[PDB]
Design a protein around this ligand. Structure first.
Ligand SMILES: [K+]
Ligand SMILES: [K+]
Ligand SMILES: [K+]
Ligand SMILES: [K+]
Lengths: 292, 292, 292, 292
């Protein structure tokens, strides 16, 4: 649902840049087999920026179909215009998705009051559970704990994906919200720390290629076995880091292809193919994780 | 025209958030009378984020209609997906605009090679002059001088709006490009310094409400009369800063309403109304400028 | 020794700026009564910058005398010249102090290799336990985990005071060092988080005025009772923050005087007396902690 | 003299870390012959951190002796304790130096009021001209234009070495001070820009090895011939950057040894020898400058 290891799944493409159903099926089967807790469909790692809203909706619907009730699906629904966020969210009302992942408006840099009004309006136009998503290095704005506290009072706003990498946020938010408000890491390299501080899981890029390890790490964390979990984390740490050696999802798509999980590593501009140096870097991190 | 004072014009709205033709007419007449060099239509200050492409195109076409050949119009055409940037650009071919202002992709954080391929592709599929736009605090990426130098070799990539406020960029770029490449500030508070270092003009928010002073300041700067320009700049400096006291364009729209230039200061979510404290700060800045 | 709540004790002064023995006695008695684990004498909070080395040594020796074996004393021994760090350390060989707190060289910005050679040389000229101290916002340099790992191999380098406030450092260092290497927070506001991640205690400014609460919070943390500890943390959080409303130790000296723990709040230039606004801010934080 | 090219001179050392008179003589002769405006003796580049005050005074006196009235000498006199700054300044009264270079207190992070009281007190107790020195990356504090403006009203506070590399500071300070207050860059890579904006000269590291070019560049700048100055600056830019590839003055001392200007490139801990990679980078920069 909204704890454990949640994959921010890639949108695998053919050489033409359109969704590859065979590759998507292979990925979803992989996540089901690996014990991944849920799938975020067409988030950032899924190239939400370069898909139009129809293409976005097609991918979510296909993912839901292919999941065939075996694994929960959360739709990425972020937009920097509130009217567009509402419209996108409405496409998925009564779809079968279990909730939405919705980013702070990017580029237009709203105030904390603007963030509050944005997310409150979105929540008011849906019965779907809403997961807030904060990632200031990409958006140009920072949803602060006080505002998260304000929004947690809205019935269907039920958690946050916190991608700052600033671990002080965990307990700053936790003290402002109720005990069933979910705290998820959006920063693979600090995710275990985040869970050790009280976080409930991670929406992960690494999980695309190390789904079983990630699922197992998060289980150990939930059970309080942090030393055991850390052995897995150490094995994965080069991936946590190097999957961002070039802009996400360039590295993770290449890694998926290298592992035979997808047919091609094609992306849409302005993402470009991985450099030779990048390939070798990512290959070494895969080797270190014991996946090649 | 791509030198002097260029206004990043507001998109004036009625109480329902729809473009107000009467207010727009008034602003354009004001810029014609006040010596503004050109108008950037539906840039950031024009709420490009919250207009759909149809509304966007409509505002540009309305701006061209109302300008009636008396002042050049530049269209905001930026998008974080290269195919969308290209499509948006095609809408304005043979419209009568003189050029396009196109921002680095926001939120998806492309590499320098990605930025190169993005802008190259946009420029390939139009004859319109292209002005690059770098604003890392808003986008999450930074178009570096080296890449600007590469792009400047493309025939119709003719300049850059450099909004870092990092004045070292002026001569880092100038040394890598031809003498005809236009360097424009996108940071009002440092724009005179930017011109003193070699810059050719400013794409300005302040110019929305101090068009005449901005035009004179930029002409004095172009003539090398920096001390004289700086007297004007000192009167405008509170405005240069306080027009960003709350997210742009909240302050500048309020200022326009206060001066009688627009009927309402309405914005679209996630922009929200100016706070009382903001009104006070902005009004004091307007008075410092001699405008009220 | 080197776990639990360790106070970074102020150097109380008379109106002339010299150490006040009566006030120091009162403070040490207070720490003994409160269950403080150890005292850091003439660290940063003790105005190491503005005491000469003789005055510094006099304060340490007086503190040791007054402690009279009831509470362990660690001497601040940092210097930005390695020869001076050695000389200062040598003053305390066979003194009765149980160890030294030694900061990364400030102002001259040594490399990681320079930090390594600096601390290794210091450790080689003493039998005293050495605690490394990293505080990049004050020093202009950052002792990275890899270098800490290197230094932990030196016999008498036994821990670190990590004052970055970056909680990812805890486990980055922990995985590189042996299990008896001590990890202490140098950032009051994040100290409980730091302990929850595996830290062993804190060298605290807050402990100067809330010694009993701090001791109790750290005991709960060590026992794994983080929820209980967090209630205390929440009571102290305004102090954790506002004791830096003006440069440390201006606020904490005023707070000590207000609580009747020291006779005067005098400091040495370039520290200056607390502002009226600062007094009221700190008074409110004391009130919130239930200390006034 | 407090305009043009002023060298922040190295303190050349033998293999035991003691000042090398023969090397110092050679450097001073070089600066006399090459048109350098003045010498800053025992500043940062002179390893002020690792000389005691006796060695410090000795080097300044030796520098004055060797200069023999042929070039003005400015003493580094900065300290993070106001009483020490004052004491150090008294050592140089009637020495023959023309002024003092005095840094904002490092490590203890005083407030703006603290900085004001610090420099005011230093200036009160000498007749020597005082040049303020701001370098926040090294000190942990930032002397802001407002405070510079306050201090400039003190009779013998005559200028500032502004080493932020933030070029907006030039006119922010210039507008708050009299036309006779000297603005000097402390950041070689941005120093020509700094002069083009209104600055009067540079206290330079690069000038240690490119004294003639630096002197010509600064004279051209003062005359308004910025394009001509910039040609020189472009040849020196690799040096401006790569002299900080490892901590200053490690690169510049190696460069001086490589040119034959000093007998050895020895430094004091915590400075350590240049790496092989550093040698290669610096040598390439020297060749770009035409010096080898
Ligand atoms: K809720
Ligand atoms: K061109
Ligand atoms: K050890
Ligand atoms: K003066």
């Amino acid at each position: 649902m909204f704890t454990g290891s949640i994959v921010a799944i890639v949108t695998p493409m053919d050489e033409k840049g359109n969704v590859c159903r065979a590759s998507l099926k292979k990925l979803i089967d992989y996540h089901v087999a690996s014990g991944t807790s849920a799938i975020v469909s067409v988030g950032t790692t899924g190239e939400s920026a370069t898909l139009n809203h129809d293409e976005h909706a097609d991918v979510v619907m296909m993912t839901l179909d292919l999941a065939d009730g075996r694994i929960p699906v959360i739709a990425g629904t972020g937009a920097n215009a509130t009217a567009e966020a509402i419209s996108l969210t409405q496409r998925f009302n009564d779809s079968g998705i279990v909730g939405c992942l919705t980013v702070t408006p990017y580029y237009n840099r709203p105030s904390q009051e603007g963030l509050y009004q944005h997310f409150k309006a979105i929540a008011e136009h849906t019965d779907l559970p809403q997961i807030l998503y904060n990632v200031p290095s990409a958006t140009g704005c920072d949803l602060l704990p006080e505002t998260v506290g304000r929004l947690a009072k809205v019935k269907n706003i039920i958690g946050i994906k916190e991608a700052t990498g600033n671990l002080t946020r965990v307990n700053q938010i936790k003290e402002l919200v109720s005990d069933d408000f979910v705290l998820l890491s959006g920063d693979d390299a600090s995710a275990l720390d985040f869970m050790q501080l009280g976080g409930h899981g991670v929406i992960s890029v690494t999980a695309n290629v190390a789904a079983r390890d990630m699922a197992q790490m998060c289980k150990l964390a939930a059970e309080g076995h942090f030393a055991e979990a850390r052995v897995i984390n150490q094995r994965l740490m080069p991936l946590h880091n190097k999957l961002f050696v070039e802009p996400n999802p360039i590295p993770v798509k290449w890694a998926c292809k290298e592992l035979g999980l997808v047919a091609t590593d094609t992306l849409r501009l302005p993402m470009t193919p991985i450099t030779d140096s990048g390939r070798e870097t990512v290959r070494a991190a895969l080797k270190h994780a014991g996946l090649l």
